[PDB]
Amino acid sequence: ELPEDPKWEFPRDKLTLGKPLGEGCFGQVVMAEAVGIDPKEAVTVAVKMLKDDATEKDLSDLVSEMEMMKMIGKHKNIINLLGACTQDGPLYVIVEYASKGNLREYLRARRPPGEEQMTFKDLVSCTYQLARGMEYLASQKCIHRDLAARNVLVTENNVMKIADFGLARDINNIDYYKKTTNGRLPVKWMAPEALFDRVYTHQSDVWSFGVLMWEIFTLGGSPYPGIPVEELFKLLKEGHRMDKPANCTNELYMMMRDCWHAVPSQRPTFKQLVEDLDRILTLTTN
């Protein structure tokens, strides 16, 4: 059913499945040891595979995620593809491992004891790292579409890496104007044009980057608290936007606000975000 891709295929006998990773609602991910995936040494990786009650769509979805990841070059702030077992057996998609888990829970875990608390600098660095990851993704003609703290993983050394490319697409693989377009994107992280106009550009991702930022500086807070998704867009159209997180600088809040500009082209680019964040990061250090 699946074609083999020599430059990615990995021997199953060379893979040892470990304990599960995550809640496992939308798939089955387990830790594992891959021998020679790097030449004869074992590497701790993560393997994405189907759940027992998976659908046909879950399969083609996973296959698509794998194919998208193949088109994304290696990058420090991106969970990259290491290989896959596609022949005679379940589909195993092997990607880089991040021991600290998703950013959302990571941020909630070190909230003020009222683990080591996150310093303001850490929050800036976190944001900075993810901005770099996105700048590279945009340079690769890739729109992630599902940016959110839950979709960011943290390594043992606190490196921030964008994950979950299930909804990600090449810039040209989006049907503009089709009523079904963007229908599977979480509403609270979604740019308005995504729904109203049925289009998706890199600027759409920066809108999402804005919500991710808010989540970061609230230390894992849930966006638009108390506001149900069925009522969110009317409000946004009326100009509504989330408030400045506590302890957040006005400068960083204004950055979030720029990301939430009604007009896509008036929002900053990931390149500009990377440059402003580098500046703020350096000033804090000094």
Next chain:
Amino acid sequence: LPEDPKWEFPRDKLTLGKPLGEGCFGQVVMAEAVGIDKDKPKEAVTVAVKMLKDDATEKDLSDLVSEMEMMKMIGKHKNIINLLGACTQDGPLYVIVEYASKGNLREYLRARRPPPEEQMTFKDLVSCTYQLARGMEYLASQKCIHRDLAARNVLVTENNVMKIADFGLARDINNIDYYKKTTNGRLPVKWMAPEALFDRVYTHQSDVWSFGVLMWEIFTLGGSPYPGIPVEELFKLLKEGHRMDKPANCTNELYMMMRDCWHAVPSQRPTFKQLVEDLDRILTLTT
């Protein structure tokens, strides 16, 4: 969202309680509905409420709507989770359905496995199967195909009444896009009839296939269907005529019933009407 007086229930007469289920594809919570039973205007009834998660998508919303509308079309039945009301104006959508204190059947059965916790008797298992056959018979008489029949989708009341739930994928028989490459693409494969994938059709006979798997689940006390067989290579095996073995504590007669349910030819599988009759016959002799 449109106004449907017959089902609208006032938000202020509802008090959301603790979460129910795992909460993967939606949010369901326990709740107290005051006067949901028109004959008792001042009485608080414990109900279950389905709503969108914090990170729901547009599609989640239109699915919950559809699920609500399908439940409006399904008449009240003892062995079926029935719609009680809905809060559709000025606020988040709430789909108020019947509460089932003991949870889904799968977990319910696994919990009663030998080493609240009182083992299940053969009669219990057959009774359970009969109640569900009856629910599907009625459902079929309502022109409705469930499409997602499974133990995880059956709930049991405080009095151990079996009720078919989760109508998120259910359709009216005449509301299926036959032969479209996308049809049946969201159905758990291990419970899917072969034709649903190979032909992209879905009839009541497709549901009896699933009922057969549901039967295997019941008699294995919550066992995982096709153990060790990944979904990726299941349909190939099915074409070859592979079928699950008889559960240790199941009679030959009940296994033959499971096998009929998994007949390759849809029209050669029994109807829910017949399953009810044979199960009724078997349950009587036993009890």
